[PDB]
Amino acid sequence: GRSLELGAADIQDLESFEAGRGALPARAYLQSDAPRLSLNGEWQFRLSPGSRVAPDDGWQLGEALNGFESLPVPSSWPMHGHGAPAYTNVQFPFAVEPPHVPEANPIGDHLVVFEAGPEFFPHALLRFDGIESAGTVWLNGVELGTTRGSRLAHEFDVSGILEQGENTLAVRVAQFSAASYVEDQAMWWLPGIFRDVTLQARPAAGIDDVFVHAGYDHITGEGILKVEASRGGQAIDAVVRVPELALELAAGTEVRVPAVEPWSAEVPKLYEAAVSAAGESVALQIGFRSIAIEDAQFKVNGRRILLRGVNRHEHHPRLGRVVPRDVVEAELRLMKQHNINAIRTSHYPPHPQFLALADQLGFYVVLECDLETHGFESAGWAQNPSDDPQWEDALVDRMRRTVERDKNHASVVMWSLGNEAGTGRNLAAMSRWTKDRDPSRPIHYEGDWSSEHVDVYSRMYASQAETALIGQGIEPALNDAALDARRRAMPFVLCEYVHAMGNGPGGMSEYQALFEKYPRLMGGFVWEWLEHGITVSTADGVDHYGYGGDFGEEVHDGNFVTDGLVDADRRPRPGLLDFKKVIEPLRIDVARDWTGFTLRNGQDFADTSAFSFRYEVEADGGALDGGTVDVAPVAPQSETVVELPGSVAALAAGLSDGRPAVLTVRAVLGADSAWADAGHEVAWGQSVREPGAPVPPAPVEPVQVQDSELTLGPVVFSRATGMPTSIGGVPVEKLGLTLWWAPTDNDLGREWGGADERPLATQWKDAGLNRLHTRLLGISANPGQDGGETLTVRTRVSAADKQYGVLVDYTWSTDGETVGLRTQVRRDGTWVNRGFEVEWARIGLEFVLGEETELVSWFGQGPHQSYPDTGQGARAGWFSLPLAKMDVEYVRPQECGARSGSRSAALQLGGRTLEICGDPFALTVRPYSQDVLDAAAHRPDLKADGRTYLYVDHALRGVGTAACGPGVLEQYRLKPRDADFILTLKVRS
């Protein structure tokens, strides 16, 4: 018959296998003295739900617009009430049938009016630095072309189309296209023109592209300089000036500079330079460095380097994929302030402005092409575009635009073909193209474990164990002897590791020890830098972050989008505090006798001259001694023993026995830097003079007996339950054993290996650990001292429908001033459920106090939380915080806020102070219960109930990274066992 469907031509274009049409050749992002007009500002915007109902009403001419409204550009339009964000991890949000697109496909018509002065004639262009995902461009009604590659730049020649005076730019943006099948990053799906739109004049005799080659000969100190310049793709005459180095040379020739200060993340030396032609000049920052793989090590400027990296997505909790420049500068400074030295642009090229900042502040950058076909894995990679020859030109284009834009920046030390895109012919073509075009940077790609087309062996979330076998070069061989030989000669990098989702990450230290031990290990990049939380303001409410599912998604992946070291507003999570410590570039081992400290320079190039070394002895009531010690500069990878002043050692020696004292040695910045002010802490070490164990009280007060109550000094017990009802007047609503905590995100992760594939959280629910019950066995008052008496309360703890349990005996003693509490724990029966051993989250006590706590003070590790396999950033000392500040504002509330390694603690309830002491314990204080915490999906769900939930733990479980990667390591797991521990309690005024 004949087709009657609508929009078939618009759809046919969206389903195209090809790159965008009509665009100028890909080139570098260059600072040019050519006239430019940024068209950023308030545009006009119309949204349609699909191509078949996108109007063809001549809107491109900007005349008589109906349905258009104001919208900022650049922008991610769902961040402005036009639709909503949608998060999927691996899942595609549309049926998988490439190259077809769903009928529900938001279409965004953009339009802006602007004026073009005579300086933009006769030749100019329009530059688009990012359009997600498919754009069509008209200028004054004539089509310029289309864009493919959402995070890549497109330029369109407007000569003869741009008219002097007023002009109308019209861009139609479709959210979904065939390109969506290759942009499946675990991300918020956010359409829009989300990066700059610029009008640029192109004068005659100008410069289109530049290719800086700045090598370094580390033997001679020579810099190897060659700056190419082209116009229309052809080499052209141009002069290269580098004033600081007394250099005038022509573009296209290679010279040897006798002496250059090499560039590195530690010392990011940049020489200002200009390459100029008659009609145009462009400014450049040149960093001399050479990259090479040698003896299975990734070496820069002749030395193996250690990558202390993070995975950086581009996200802003209000603007989506638009990251304001001042937030970029801030977050990169925050990285430096936490000893980070490397960045992977997961999983697409960043904003062009990012590259210069990385050059200046100092980061080894893995710049990654915009490619990910993850969602094809669930079907065994059938139809994977990475191996579909029809996608070759589209994927080579993505790699070309990636490389051409940023090829001049010294901070880029690796090109990455993409992420989690399988294996395929098109990936090899992208590698073949990159190796030919820019052989000065090694190629990275984790998705092909055989590593056939790369120069480094990359993996994500490989266990500490496998990492140690790789570091020794004894990993299992590949079937192909030749490929195995190639890969074994490669250095190894973890492009993603220690997944930082929620409470965690655990096991960072074990990775780091391997990084330091095995040169083949290049280091790793944490997943990930930031949480992609989106700010939602509650009706009649405060703000909170929303994640997957909180925006009406039919298909989503929950809070896996919030899996970062900082929150969306760049506030650190405890994991960043620990990370900073783990990757600290210096090691300070303070001598036990306080006579000195061993200092190892862990940096790769710089000495210790930039650091001032300070010490302080702190005690119960403030600092006792402190100052600065001068340290002869220590070479990279060298060690020395630094003497401390005799007054410090003499102080420790003369310290009365049992008095706590902490010696802390810090390496701070001796002077301001581009990323921190002087005195910023870089590394630290400590030696602690522990306090003696608290003497148990003498049991001189006897037990006392009423019909329904018992009294033993300051403690009142309920004769029915045997549990205290008050201590020093503080009401005790409950006291019992704890074996469970509100599951972390990691506990909700499935722990692979072994026949048990339930997450730990599910193992606990099945075992009934969240619903413990206690039965009283007996109460007995026993003879103490000088007529006094101890009180022993025997109980058994278990759960409904379970035969296993634990016998808990509480022995109380008092001298009227302080209470002595001995808890003894003993296993009864075999702790097996559903064929698998039950594991405990902890061995502790929960005190529920009938009054609110305003302040928590303790001596131990702090100020932030610490768990068995975390808390590296928690140092020994005295701390004190308001109850609200003890918590951690994770987006999905979960177990957090424990303070491991506490020797003493003090809770201030109103006018009174409850003091806990005894053998080391973990401390947690909350204004709500564990069941409220576990039930809470968002922070607003946390409601204080006027009580205080005090948790004192004799043993804790680790937190691991089971949400993605290794679970809790063996040494940190907690199997049911017998245990016993003492405490001493006291209430004042």
Ligand X SMILES: OC[C@H]1O[C@@](CO)(O[C@H]2O[C@H](CO)[C@@H](O)[C@H](O)[C@H]2O)[C@@H](O)[C@@H]1O
Q: Which two tokens stand for residue 188?
A: 């918020």
Other CB atoms within a 10 A radius of the CB of residue 314 amount to: 24
Q: Where are the beta strands (DSSP E) in 345-469?
A: 364-368, 412-416, 443-444, 457-460
**By CB under 6 A, is residue 466 in contact with ligand X?**
no
- φ, ψ at 343 (rounded to 5°): -145, 135
CB-closest chain residue to ligand X: 33
Q: For the CB of residue 822, give the shortest distance to a second copy in the complex, in Å.
A: 16
Does 901 sit near ligand X (CB under 6 A)?
Answer: no
Say how far apart CA 749 and CA 963 lie, in whole Å: 4
Question: How far is Cα 445 from Cα 738, in angstroms, rounded to an integer?
Answer: 46
Paired tokens of 116? 């073009």
E-state strands within 377-491:
412-416, 443-444, 457-460
Q: Binding partner of residue 5 among ligand X, a second copy, Na ion, none, CB under 5 to 8 Å per kind?
A: a second copy
Stretch that binds ligand X, among 207-215, 275-283, 317-325, 748-756 (CB under 6 A): 275-283
Residue 498 or 663 with smaller CB distance to Na ion: 498
- Which DSSP state fits 745? T
- Between residues 54 and 883, which has the closer beta carbon with respect to a second copy? 54
- Given the complex with a second copy, which of 52 and 226 has the nearer CB atom? 52
Long-range pairs for 56-60: beta carbons < 8 A, 24 or more residues apart: 58/141, 59/109, 59/111, 59/170, 60/111, 60/138, 60/141, 60/168, 60/170
Nearest distance, CB of residue 35 and ligand X, angstroms: 7
Q: How many residues bind Na ion (CB under 5 A)?
A: 4
Q: 3-class SS at 679?
A: coil
Q: Classify 881 as helix, strand or coil.
A: strand
Closest distance of CB 551 from a second copy, Å: 15
* Chosen from ligand X, Na ion, a second copy, none, partner binding at 95 (C-beta under 5 to 8 Å by type): a second copy
Active site residue 528: no
Q: Is 509 in the site for Na ion (CB under 5 A)?
A: no
781 binds, among ligand X, a second copy, Na ion, none (CB under 5 to 8 A by kind): a second copy
Which of Na ion, a second copy, ligand X, none does residue 948 bind (CB under 5 to 8 Å by kind)? none
CA 785 to chain centre: 57
Binds 782, which of ligand X, Na ion, a second copy, none (CB < 5 to 8 A, cut-off by type)?
Answer: a second copy
Supply angle C-alpha 609, 611, 612, rounded to 5: 110
The entry of a second copy, ligand X, Na ion, none that residue 485 binds, CB within 5 to 8 Å by partner kind = none
Which region, judged by CB under 5 A, interacts with Na ion, from 23-31, 551-559, 571-579, 957-965? 957-965
How many residues make contact with ligand X (CB under 6 A)? 5
Site for ligand X in 30-69 (CB under 6 A): 33
Strands 107-116 and 443-444: unpaired
Which residues contact residue 539 at a Cβ distance below 8 angstroms, ignoring those fewer than 6 apart? none
Residues 741 and 840 sit within 8 Å (Cβ to Cβ): no
Q: Residue 554 binds which entry of ligand X, a second copy, Na ion, none, with Cβ cut-offs from 5 to 8 Å by kind?
A: a second copy
Residues 187-246 that bind ligand X (CB under 6 A): 203
Distance of closest approach, residue 252 Cβ to ligand X, in angstroms = 19
Task: Select the residue interacting with ligand X from 279, 691, 736, 940 (CB under 6 A).
Answer: 279
- Give the residues across from 272 on adjacent strands: 285
User: Binding to Na ion by residue 615, rule CB under 5 A?
Assistant: no
586/209 Cα distance (integer angstroms): 42
C-alpha dihedral sign at 345, 347, 353, 355 = positive
Alpha-carbon span 174 to 492, nearest angstrom:
40
Residue 461 binding partner per list ligand X, a second copy, Na ion, none, with a CB distance cut-off of 5 to 8 Å that depends on partner kind: Na ion
**Closer residue to a second copy, CB minimum distance, 4 or 259:** 4
Two tokens at 537?
């303001």
Segment interacting with Na ion, rule: CB under 5 A, options 304-312, 457-465, 590-598, 646-654: 457-465
- 135 in helix, strand or coil? strand
The least distance separating Na ion from the CB of residue 741, rounded to whole angstroms, comes to: 22
Considering the complex, what minimum distance in angstroms separates the CB of residue 831 from a second copy? Answer: 12
Tokens, residue 724: 């205290």
By CB under 6 A, residue 873 contacts ligand X: no
CB of 407 to ligand X, least distance (A): 23
Q: Which position has the token pair 């008092």?
A: 814
Nearest distance from residue 981's CB to Na ion, in Å?
Answer: 33
Smallest separation (angstroms) from Na ion to the CB of 472: 19
For this structure, is 496 an active site residue? yes
Query: CB 242 → ligand X: shortest distance, Å?
Result: 16
966 is a site residue for ligand X (CB under 6 A): no
Quote the least distance from Cβ 33 to ligand X, whole Å.
Answer: 3
| Partner touching 465 among ligand X, Na ion, a second copy, none, CB below 5 to 8 Å by kind | none
Query: Given candidates 156, 288, 364, 497, which one binds Na ion under the rule CB under 5 A?
Result: 497
Write out the two tokens for 235.
């080499």
134, 105 contact by CB (below 8 A): no
Q: Does 281 bind ligand X (CB under 6 A)?
A: yes
Residue with tokens 């040897």: 256
Q: Cβ(516)–Cβ(585) under 8 Å?
A: no
Residue 762 binds: one of ligand X, a second copy, Na ion, none (C-beta under 5 to 8 A by kind): none
- Residue 965's binding partner among a second copy, ligand X, Na ion, none (Cβ under 5 to 8 angstroms by kind) is Na ion
Residue 282: name the closest of 236, 238, 327 by CA: 238
555 is in the binding site of which of a second copy, Na ion, ligand X, none (Cβ under 5 to 8 A by kind)? a second copy
State in angstroms the smallest separation of the CB of 118 from ligand X: 12
DSSP SS3 for 638: coil
Residue type for 21, please? R
Contact 597, 665 (CB under 8 A): yes
Closest CA to 418 of 351, 364, 368, 344: 368
**Among residues 132, 280, 446, 496, which one is catalytic?**
496
**φ, ψ of residue 401 in degrees (nearest 5):** -60, -40
Of 738, 756, 742, 741, nearest to 967 by C-alpha is: 756
Which CB sits closer to a second copy, 150 or 180? Answer: 180
Residues that bind a second copy (CB under 8 A): 1-8, 50, 52-53, 88, 90-97, 100, 102-104, 375, 378-379, 382-383, 554-555, 703, 705, 708, 710, 719-722, 771, 773-776, 778-783, 789, 796, 798-803, 805
Q: What are phi and psi of 866, to 5 degrees?
A: -155, 135
Cα separation of 83 and 77, whole Å? 8
Find the part of the chain contacting ligand X (CB under 6 A) among 20-28, 279-287, 589-597, 709-717: 279-287
Q: How far apart are CA 520 and CA 644, in angstroms?
A: 36
- 155, 280, 420, 446: the catalytic one is 420
- Residue closer to Na ion by CB (options 526, 779) is 526
Q: Which does 281 bind (CB under 5 to 8 A by kind): ligand X, a second copy, Na ion, none?
A: ligand X
Please tell me the distance from the alpha carbon of residue 614 to that of residue 645, in angstroms, as a whole number.
Answer: 11
902 with 688: CB under 8 angstroms?
A: no
CB of 735 to a second copy, least distance (A): 14
Nearer to a second copy, 94 or 579 (CB): 94
- In what helix (H) or strand (E) does residue 256 lie, and over which residues does it extend? strand 254-257
Query: Interaction with Na ion in 461-480: which residues (CB under 5 A)?
Result: 461
Binding segment for ligand X among 122-130, 278-286, 315-323, 662-670 (CB under 6 A)? Answer: 278-286
Q: Name which of 133, 47, 111 is nearest 84 in CA terms.
A: 47
* Residues designated catalytic: 420, 496
Binding-site ranges for ligand X (CB under 6 A) = 33, 203, 279-281
Q: Please give the residue ranges that form the binding site for Na ion (CB under 5 A).
A: 461, 497-498, 965
